[PDB]
């Protein structure tokens, strides 16, 4: 055992060796939480000058002599450079979250700060959105040819609201890391998620014998357009016929809940969520196009 | 304007200044990569190390003369704490993530590192878990006594399901942050999480109309509990008393499978949930005892 006691030595070695890289290490990290103090004093002082200075050259905009115009083109220009370049530092600095991931993961910082790391965790969402998007096909076509009991599609549509709320979260990291795809999509992902919900506590009469089919259908157009959405990461055509699709389910649904002498509460809460997603996405789709042109 | 211009000398000043300082960063952040790629090192040399002595001595163990065996007695000293201080740097260390955080928040670090950052996030957990039991509390004795209608309960069901999955994901990334409070908590928050599905989608007959009371109070019970384990940071008697209502429940049910001539699939299902988060905590609380004696 007394290779044991040399290799001990030897290990009392390393240890020390570790011990001395150890607190080095706290060195740095208190260097690190000192520039980062310093850089948020940095980011005070800079969108104060910024909000001042888009202030001067907004009162400067009224018109006198053609020396300012030319001074207030200038700045204009050098004003666009600005926020670019602020853009740019405020890209890499770490940042304070939303208020949605506050109110899940709480005061937590999720920034990688890191270009290829950035890219590296676009690439990992992309994978992981085509194979839920995978399971969830083999799921749509599936219930509704095989299996249809209740329970399966319980089964499925909480599947399908996981899936929702794991995505939102996801997007929530994505905006607070990196670039800005805030607009329509994560308002879409929560009325969508809502709507998942409401197909789920339907009383199971005949009206929802009725419906299941159309929706199932709906579903197997959503993962195709999901799925041809990211072999991309053509694709208007079939967003088109996406939306129309969704208006056939709507006005279908809406004349249904006039069509039967007694309704429940969820046949008429449940049509105009499906109206709300398509006047949103298909007049998004337009100004990309416009964006476009 | 010549007075924005002099600003402007002013901030091209301090933003040269800031690109001092930020390519200063960036040199730190590269630093800090090397040593991050050093401490892994020294992890997988740690651990090696670690399990060759210990395989040392467990073959060392076997009985020989006086010597070793106050050798091995030195050893097993030092070997404790030779854990306790590893298991200091692997505190402080940043660690790659579970499997279930993996699976939701894909590859990001959560770690901290930091003593006090822990603590104040253990601070924020406790403040958000009192903040919505809160509100689960005016809901479960609420719903019981104003609004017996089944929209409402759905509502409170969805609030408890959202509840228990960002409890799960909280204690997640506090697991893989500090403390391992892993055992028997996180799979009970799973069991419970599904436990509160199986109520949402009853076909509300009147056999649903019957199980609502008992449920109602059950929840009242676990939130007092909760409230009180809380203010704590006395509780076993009425922890006690908790697992016989969760009994009684359980019990109940149970016969109520056997009294109606048709029964769904739902009552059969949910009962056995109650009597596996019966056999569970119960007995770990025992074993806190245990502890305590």
Redesign the interface.
Known sequence: ?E??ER??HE?EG?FQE?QE??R??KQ??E??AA?QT??SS?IS??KK?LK??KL?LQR?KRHASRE?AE?VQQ?AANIKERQDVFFD?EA?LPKKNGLYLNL?????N?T??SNQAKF??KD??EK?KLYLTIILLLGAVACRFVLHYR?TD?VFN?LLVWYY??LT??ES?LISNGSRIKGWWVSHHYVSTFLS?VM??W??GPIYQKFRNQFLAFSIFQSCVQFLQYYYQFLLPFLFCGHFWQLYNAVTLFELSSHEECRE?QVFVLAFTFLILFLGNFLTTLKVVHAKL
């Not at 899940?104 to 937590?108: A, M, Q, Y």
């Open positions: 055992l290779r044991c290799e001990w290990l390393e570790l890289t150890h080095i290490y740095k990290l260097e690190l520039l310093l850089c940095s002082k800079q000058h001042d200075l001067t400067c300012e001074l700045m530092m890499y899940v993961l709480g005061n937590v999720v990688l700060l590296a965790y990992e969402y992981f329970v319980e909480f709320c794991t979260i996801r990291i919900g789920l506590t009383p199971n509460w």
